Amino acid sequence: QVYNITWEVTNGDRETVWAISGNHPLWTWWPVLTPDLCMLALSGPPHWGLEYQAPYSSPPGPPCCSGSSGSSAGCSRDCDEPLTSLTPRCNTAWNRLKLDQVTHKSSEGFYVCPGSHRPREAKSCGGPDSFYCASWGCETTGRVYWKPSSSWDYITVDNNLTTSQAVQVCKDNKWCNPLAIQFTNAGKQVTSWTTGHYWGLRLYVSGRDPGLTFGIRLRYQNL
Amino acid sequence: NTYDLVALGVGSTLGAGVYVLAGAVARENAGPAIVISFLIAALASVLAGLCYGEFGARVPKTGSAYLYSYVTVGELWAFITGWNLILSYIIGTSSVARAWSATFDELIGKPIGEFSRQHMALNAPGVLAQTPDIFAVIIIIILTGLLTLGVKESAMVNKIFTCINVLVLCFIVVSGFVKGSIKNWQLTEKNFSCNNNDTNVKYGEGGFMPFGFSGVLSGAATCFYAFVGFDCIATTGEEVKNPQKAIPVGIVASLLICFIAYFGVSAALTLMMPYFCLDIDSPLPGAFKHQGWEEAKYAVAIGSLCALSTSLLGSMFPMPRVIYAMAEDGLLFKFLAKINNRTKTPVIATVTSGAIAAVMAFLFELKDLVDLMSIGTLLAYSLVAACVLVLRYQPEQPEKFSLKSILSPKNVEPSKFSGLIVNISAGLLAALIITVCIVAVLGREALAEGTLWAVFVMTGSVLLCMLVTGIIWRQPESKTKLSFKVPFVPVLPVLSIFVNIYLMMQLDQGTWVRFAVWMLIGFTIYFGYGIWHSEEA
Numbered sequence: 200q201v202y203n204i205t206w207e208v209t210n211g212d213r214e215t216v217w218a219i220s221g222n223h224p225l226w227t228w229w230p231v232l233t234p235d236l237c238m239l240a241l242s243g244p245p246h247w248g249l250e251y252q253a254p255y256s257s258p259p260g261p262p263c264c265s266g267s268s269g270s271s272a273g274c275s276r277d278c279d280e281p282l283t284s285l286t287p288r289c290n291t292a293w294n295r296l297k298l299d300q301v302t303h304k305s306s307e308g309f310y311v312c313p314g315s316h317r318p319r320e321a322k323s324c325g326g327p328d329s330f331y332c333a334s335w336g337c338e339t340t341g342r343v344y345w346k347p348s349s350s351w352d353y354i355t356v357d358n359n360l361t362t363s364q365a366v367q368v369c370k371d372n373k374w375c376n377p378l379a380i381q382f383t384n385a386g387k388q389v390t391s392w393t394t395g396h397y398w399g400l401r402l403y404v405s406g407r408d409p410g411l412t413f414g415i416r417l418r419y420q421n422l
Numbered sequence: 423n424t425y426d427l428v429a430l431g432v433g434s435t436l437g438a439g440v441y442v443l444a445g446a447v448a449r450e451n452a453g454p455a456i457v458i459s460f461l462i463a464a465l466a467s468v469l470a471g472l473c474y475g476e477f478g479a480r481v482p483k484t485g486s487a488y489l490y491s492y493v494t495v496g497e498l499w500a501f502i503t504g505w506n507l508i509l510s511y512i513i514g515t516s517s518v519a520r521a522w523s524a525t526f527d528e529l530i531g532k533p534i535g536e537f538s539r540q541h542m543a544l545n546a547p548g549v550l551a552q553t554p555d556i557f558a559v560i561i562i563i564i565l566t567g568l569l570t571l572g573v574k575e576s577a578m579v580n581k582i583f584t585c586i587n588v589l590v591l592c593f594i595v596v597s598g599f600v601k602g603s604i605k606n607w608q609l610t611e612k613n614f615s616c617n618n619n620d621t622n623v624k625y626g627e628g629g630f631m632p633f634g635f636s637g638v639l640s641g642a643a644t645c646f647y648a649f650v651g652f653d654c655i656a657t658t659g660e661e662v663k664n665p666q667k668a669i670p671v672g673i674v675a676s677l678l679i680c681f682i683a684y685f686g687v688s689a690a691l692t693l694m695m696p697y698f699c700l701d702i703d704s705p706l707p708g709a710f711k712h713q714g715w716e717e718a719k720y721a722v723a724i725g726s727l728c729a730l731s732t733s734l735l736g737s738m739f740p741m742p743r744v745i746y747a748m749a750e751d752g753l754l755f756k757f758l759a760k761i762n763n764r765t766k767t768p769v770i771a772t773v774t775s776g777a778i779a780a781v782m783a784f785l786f787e788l789k790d791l792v793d794l795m796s797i798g799t800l801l802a803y804s805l806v807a808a809c810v811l812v813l814r815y816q817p818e819q820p821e822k823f824s825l826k827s828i829l830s831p832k833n834v835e836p837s838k839f840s841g842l843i844v845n846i847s848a849g850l851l852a853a854l855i856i857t858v859c860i861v862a863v864l865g866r867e868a869l870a871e872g873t874l875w876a877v878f879v880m881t882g883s884v885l886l887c888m889l890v891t892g893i894i895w896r897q898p899e900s901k902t903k904l905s906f907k908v909p910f911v912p913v914l915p916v917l918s919i920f921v922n923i924y925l926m927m928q929l930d931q932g933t934w935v936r937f938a939v940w941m942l943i944g945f946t947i948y949f950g951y952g953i954w955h956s957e958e959a
């Protein structure tokens with residue numbers, strides 16, 4: 200029968216940070232999830248600068264002076280200055296621009312590794328401390344130059360907006376790093392979503408490769 | 423006697439550099455990491471100072487690097503050095519007048535400044551000052567009138583002003599450590615709201631290094647000009663009880679004292695108030711106001727106006743003197759050389775330099791003038807370092823080659839062949855460090871990406887730099903005794919040139935364009951007029 204199905208995306212603390220709902224039969228509705236990469240970092244690792252921000256909290260940081268609201272008191276010009284010296288993170292609109300650049304630049308990017316649902320052969324991949332990405336080959340999806348893929352991982356992850364589309368959303372001081380997550384055929388056959396499955400995501404950068412953990416889970420009720 | 427040398431150094435070095443520079447750097451280029459920007463600029467200066475010790479040792483007559491170059495290395499090199507020195511003095515006068523005018527304007531009040539905002543507007547922020555400093559022009563015209571009249575810097579009043587400056591510096595450091603808090607070096611997005619409704623603020627990352635190590639390096643490049651003044655130790659003139667041993671200790675101690683002062687003052691400034699809320703016009707008094715010690719604005723006002731004076735006068739007094747010296751030698755136009763019979767001073771040169779400084783203060787921002795002076799001074803110091811490096815290997819004055827002659831010369835003292843090979847090696851090495859810095863600054867992202875062309879050029883340039891430095895090392899040094907010698911003459915001058923050129927490469931494109939135009943005017947004067955009327959012709 201049709202139920203109110205809700206697909207929820209949660210931070211590493213397993214608190215829901217994004218959700219979508221629809222009246223559909225169970226295991227028949229497989230929408231594209233579009234959580235923001237920054238929503239996943241809410242209350243997450245210290246690198247992203249959102250470790251004290253609650254889920255569904257508004258994007259922190261002062262507005263860009265180039266925003267659609269125009270100039271205002273205390274507005275930042277960092278959104279127009281070169282971003283080469285900025286850290287890719289979610290703490291400011293210009294830091295979100297730098298994160299968007301890092302996730303879009305061909306050399307740079309982001310990769311995603313499966314968590315508890317990975318086969319036992321991937322035990323060496325590591326736990327949450329490594330974001331399940333202790334070494335290359337554990338990453339099953341994500342946008343990088345080598346286009347990793349898996350015949351068994353339950354989701355695929357990509358950037359949702361192009362650089363030009365995302366830049367203006369960032370200058371408006373809104374969430375502007377939306378991911379596009381699509382269920383694979385394996386995910387469409389899997390039914391353990393009621394318990395949720397977790398992935399690690401790490402930026403591919405000349406450094407420590409900062410990362411976060413996120414989860415996807417299904418909730419449903421009568422309708 | 424060594425104590426006297428270090429005292430001379432600390433006195434000669436400008437004490438007003440931090441009052442005007444600390445805010446501009448700590449807000450625009452570095453944050454609290456300006457504390458480190460001052461350190462690098464110190465070290466870069468030290469390498470220069472030691473070379474000056476040898477350079478002033480090569481000429482018994484004390485003077486400027488112009489005179490030393492003219493006696494030792496020749497007409498063109500001396501012209502370039504003197505022209506860079508002219509820019510340094512003119513633009514230092516302009517910058518210090520800017521600072522003094524801003525301090526007084528803030529003290530008297532903004533409406534006095536807002537008269538300019540009512541009646542004048544350049545309207546070209548990128549290539550022109552967002553606000554013209556008419557009052558700095560008034561100061562410069564007054565001081566040029568005084569200097570033309572024959573008024574000269576007074577030693578006693580200068581000592582008094584340096585003492586008051588140091589006392590106010592100590593008070594600022596104490597107040598920074600009392601009222602300032604380490605939280606201002608750890609600011610985050612939560613603290614990215616400034617009380618004043620000031621727009622287009624550069625928040626940056628926040629914390630201790632909001633603009634990164636590239637910002638720290640740009641600040642160090644901009645802070646290099648503040649440590650200028652140690653020349654007086656190399657050019658002491660009086661006899662020293664242990665010259666090659668007392669001169670370097672004096673130079674290093676003076677530069678360390680200056681770095682301690684600048685470190686303490688910039689630390690106080692960045693600890694009392696957020697770096698992004700610093701007041702470029704007058705950082706220290708506004709920082710005091712933010713902490714509620716508004717009365718201190720007067721004390722700093724007492725000190726700053728004194729310190730800036732000791733700076734402005736110091737830049738202004740020699741500014742006509744180089745022009746006069748060059749004009750007599752025919753390098754510059756003879757009409758500047760003429761001295762009034764009534765004043766017994768080079769009136770025309772003083773008036774012309776004053777007008778140029780007034781125009782530069784009027785039309786250009788404080789940071790723009792600062793960076794132009796920094797680039798000119800860095801070029802002058804790199805030229806001095808290259809001069810010492812070259813002169814160490816020339817024969818004492820009254821082509822084909824073989825690999826055995828190049829790599830293994832058997833002569834115990836420099837031959838003309840050795841001198842020519844060292845000249846060629848110095849030129850090639852200078853071009854090669856220029857290439858290294860270009861790749862390290864323009865190709866910086868390319869190097870981070872590891873692109874084949876950038877890494878290839880970098881590795882080849884660095885290895886060939888080592889090889890050329892080695893070929894210089896292998897040549898015999900001049901047995902001539904000097905009162906001072908740079909210790910590691912094959913390496914230390916080369917590192918000085920490297921650091922200076924890298925710091926120059928940190929400066930903005932506008933600074934490079936202004937400097938290129940200035941050098942173009944200099945070369946036009948030299949090649950069109952200077953060569954033909956030179957007194958040595």
Ligand SMILES: *[C@@H]1O[C@H](CO[C@@H]2O[C@@H](C)[C@@H](O)[C@@H](O)[C@@H]2O)[C@@H](O[C@@H]2O[C@H](CO)[C@@H](O[C@@H]3O[C@H](CO)[C@@H](O)[C@H](O[C@H]4O[C@H](CO)[C@@H](O)[C@H](O)[C@@H]4O)[C@@H]3O)[C@H](O)[C@H]2NC(C)=O)[C@H](O)[C@H]1NC(C)=O
Nearest residue numbers: 203204205207215217218219220221255418419420421422
């Ligand atoms: C179908 O189901 C969805 C989702 O179900 C919700 O989660 C389940 C696990 C279960 O607990 C359900 O009981 C629960 O409703 C329904 O969508 C939710 O609807 C409620 C209200 O009916 C929303 O409640 C909140 O109310 C706040 C004021 O009291 C309001 O401020 C909230 O908006 C803000 O917060 C939400 C997240 O909480 C955010 O998405 C908004 O953009 C805004 O910031 C919100 O309205 C829930 O938030 C809704 N969503 C979720 C995930 O709970 C849907 O109504 C239901 N439809 C039918 C026909 O049954």
Ligand SMILES: CC(C)CCC[C@@H](C)[C@H]1CC[C@H]2[C@@H]3CC=C4C[C@@H](OC(=O)CCC(=O)O)CC[C@]4(C)[C@H]3CC[C@]12C
Nearest residue numbers: 462465466468469634635636639862866917918921924
């Ligand atoms: C006075 C005598 C006894 C000692 C002199 C020591 C100097 C030769 C050293 C001290 C600090 C050094 C500097 C410290 C840091 C740098 C930055 C470095 O560039 C980077 O690290 C760029 C990094 C980036 O890309 O962000 C280039 C050399 C330089 C200027 C170094 C050059 C050599 C310096 C001046």
Ligand SMILES: *[C@@H]1O[C@H](CO)[C@@H](O[C@@H]2O[C@H](CO)[C@@H](O)[C@H](O)[C@H]2NC(C)=O)[C@H](O)[C@H]1NC(C)=O
Nearest residue numbers: 231232233234235358359360374376377378379
């Ligand atoms: C993520 O990508 C989707 C698809 O590209 C975006 O959805 C589009 O939104 C625009 C504006 O609302 C619509 O005109 C299009 O019809 C939508 N396309 C589809 C396929 O639905 C979405 O806006 C992007 N951003 C987020 C946060 O999801």
Ligand SMILES: *[C@@H]1O[C@H](CO)[C@@H](O[C@@H]2O[C@H](CO)[C@@H](O)[C@H](O)[C@H]2NC(C)=O)[C@H](O)[C@H]1NC(C)=O
Nearest residue numbers: 251603604605606607608609610611612613614
């Ligand atoms: C920067 O902002 C943070 C958070 O807004 C400040 O931290 C809080 O400061 C208040 C003072 O009103 C304290 O009561 C809280 O206990 C502090 N919380 C934390 C987690 O630190 C911080 O003080 C601000 N810093 C500055 C220099 O203003």
Ligand SMILES: *[C@@H]1O[C@H](CO)[C@@H](O)[C@H](O)[C@H]1NC(C)=O
Nearest residue numbers: 272532616617618619620621
């Ligand atoms: C803030 O704005 C008000 C007018 O809205 C103005 O009077 C005040 O001077 C501003 N604060 C400043 C400039 O520090």
